[PDB]
Design a binder for this molecule. Structure first.
Ligand SMILES: Nc1nc2c(ncn2[C@@H]2O[C@H](COP(=O)(O)O)[C@@H](O)[C@H]2O)c(=O)[nH]1
Ligand SMILES: Nc1nc2c(ncn2[C@@H]2O[C@H](COP(=O)(O)O)[C@@H](O)[C@H]2O)c(=O)[nH]1
Ligand SMILES: Nc1nc2c(ncn2[C@@H]2O[C@H](COP(=O)(O)O)[C@@H](O)[C@H]2O)c(=O)[nH]1
Ligand SMILES: Nc1nc2c(ncn2[C@@H]2O[C@H](COP(=O)(O)O)[C@@H](O)[C@H]2O)c(=O)[nH]1
Ligand SMILES: Nc1ccn([C@@H]2O[C@H](COP(=O)(O)O)[C@@H](O)[C@H]2O)c(=O)n1
Ligand SMILES: Nc1ccn([C@@H]2O[C@H](COP(=O)(O)O)[C@@H](O)[C@H]2O)c(=O)n1
Ligand SMILES: Nc1ccn([C@@H]2O[C@H](COP(=O)(O)O)[C@@H](O)[C@H]2O)c(=O)n1
Ligand SMILES: Nc1ccn([C@@H]2O[C@H](COP(=O)(O)O)[C@@H](O)[C@H]2O)c(=O)n1
Lengths: 132, 132, 132, 132
């Protein structure tokens, strides 16, 4: 036994590259800055993300929704090592969607078609941003 | 005499199945997680929902809107029994729509065409989610 | 000299009929529950609203916008008398738009094409709602 | 060394003309009231804005985004002088986007195509608004 802990907004540090959780429902999508990281996330060219990563979109209110995670050890290790923030990833986590995001989930009735983690570049001032 | 009490977000427990209040206006729709439940909600194949359930969408501010309910005894009984949360349904209730939802109501001028309660499944981690 | 006071959300009482401020920009519209009233608002069949009512949409932040009002005596008198709430209308008022509304104003750059006050009916439970 | 300070909502005073930060991503745009000013902002007919002004759109959470600025001295001087508020512009600033704005940035993945500062007029009551 165990519990789903919150991946807080603190794990996103501005000026660093970003890992974007991308989720398609079954029409309805949802882009969520996941984790600011030091290097890209290349996976083994063998394996797909869905082997180490399973996600559940549940409602938590009439207006609000959360996303729950199960992160198998390999990814948990890869991600802690990649993180700008001090080793923040646990096997069982969730994050909250804001009223705006929440409602997209709710309309598509929570039904995840696909999802993936994309590397998103930093911008012109990023160097200078994070050094401040 | 009596008063309309609030169906709070607490009645939605994540990991459990969900009853979705679906509302069409007269173009304009509105999906609202209503109540997390243990089993589905089958009604008598005879009766329609609208016999035990009447709803009113009124504004409560310049930006915000509420939905009011009258739940006839049969449904009030069926729902309390179905609820994951301890017996939360009263005959006269309302719930608040968030600024985002509110505005859809306001644009369609509150005019409800139709409405219904749909069963929405749980997702992959749901078992594990609610046991935490 | 004088100041623009806030028409608060309190002046909207649920269960009563509603006066909707409708605003078109120059594509971009904006519906705002204005004032809950006891009877409809018929104007003199002679005069248009714009004779007693002039409105200004200004920004108040990077994300937020307000609407300012000048209400000539006739309308100020008609409206206080119509109000469910105790005589709330002053000659110079404003109201705040929520982040959601605000942004529609901002995109259309605040440029009001037209505006009007429409009577909006009450719904099925309205009687019972306001008597609670 | 140095830090990016916040251009607060206070620098927008209602009743005064407005400078609108306009940003196109690479489909996705974003209009943000930047700074309320006393006169228009004409630049040298020679130079483009992008010579004194470079901007970076970074995420600060799972749901939220900021815009960072580098304002070269000429513009910093021109803007302080133009400002209604007491000399508020520093070389390195940022401003927060609200959940609504944030999400447009996030979807287009932060990738700024173009941006510019437009003069936006005041409205009918503006005179009277700011004198109150
Ligand atoms: N609640 C939830 N349902 C999901 C998820 N991924 C897929 N689904 C499917 O979505 C269904 C609920 O939405 P529905 O298809 O009934 O509108 C469930 O039966 C489930 O099979 C998820 O992450 N959360
Ligand atoms: N306010 C409100 N009006 C409703 C509702 N359901 C139907 N209506 C109808 O919507 C009308 C108000 O919107 P309108 O059609 O004038 O734009 C009322 O006259 C009423 O007949 C409801 O739940 N709330
Ligand atoms: N700021 C503001 N501008 C308005 C309003 N009504 C009309 N306008 C016009 O909108 C112009 C600003 O928007 P623009 O047309 O430059 O995008 C002003 O020059 C003004 O003539 C109002 O209520 N507020
Ligand atoms: N993060 C960020 N990226 C920007 C900005 N302006 C341009 N970009 C470009 O956007 C890319 C990230 O978005 P992508 O094109 O990978 O979806 C970066 O590689 C960068 O070259 C900005 O202001 N912020
Ligand atoms: N984060 C977001 C933003 C928009 N969307 C959807 O994708 C489409 C594009 O919406 P906008 O035109 O509002 O960007 C709409 O159908 C909207 O419902 C989404 O699914 N997830
Ligand atoms: N909860 C919601 C979400 C969207 N809608 C409406 O249905 C349509 C789909 O909107 P999106 O493209 O933003 O999903 C729009 O016309 C929007 O006004 C609604 O009526 N209730
Ligand atoms: N309160 C509102 C809601 C939507 N709108 C606009 O009218 C159109 C209908 O938007 P939805 O499809 O989101 O309802 C969009 O162009 C939107 O920008 C508006 O101008 N004022
Ligand atoms: N501030 C805003 C508002 C809308 N938009 C986008 O421009 C289009 C117009 O959206 P509405 O119809 O909601 O006004 C949509 O594709 C929306 O994603 C934007 O990019 N920045």
């Amino acid at each position: 036994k165990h519990s789903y802990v919150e991946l807080k907004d603190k794990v996103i540090v501005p000026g660093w590259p970003t890992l974007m959780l991308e989720i398609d429902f079954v029409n309805q999508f949802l882009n969520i800055p996941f984790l600011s990281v030091k290097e890209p996330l290349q996976l083994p060219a063998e394996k797909k993300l869905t082997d180490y990563f399973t996600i559940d979109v549940e409602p938590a209110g009439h207006s609000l929704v959360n996303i729950y995670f199960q992160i198998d050890d390999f990814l948990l290790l890869t991600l802690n090592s990649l993180s700008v923030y001090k080793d923040p990833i646990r096997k069982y986590m969730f994050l909250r969607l804001n009223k705006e995001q929440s409602k997209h989930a709710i309309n598509a009735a929570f039904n995840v078609f696909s999802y993936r983690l994309r590397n998103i570049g930093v911008g012109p001032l990023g160097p200078d941003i994070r050094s401040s």
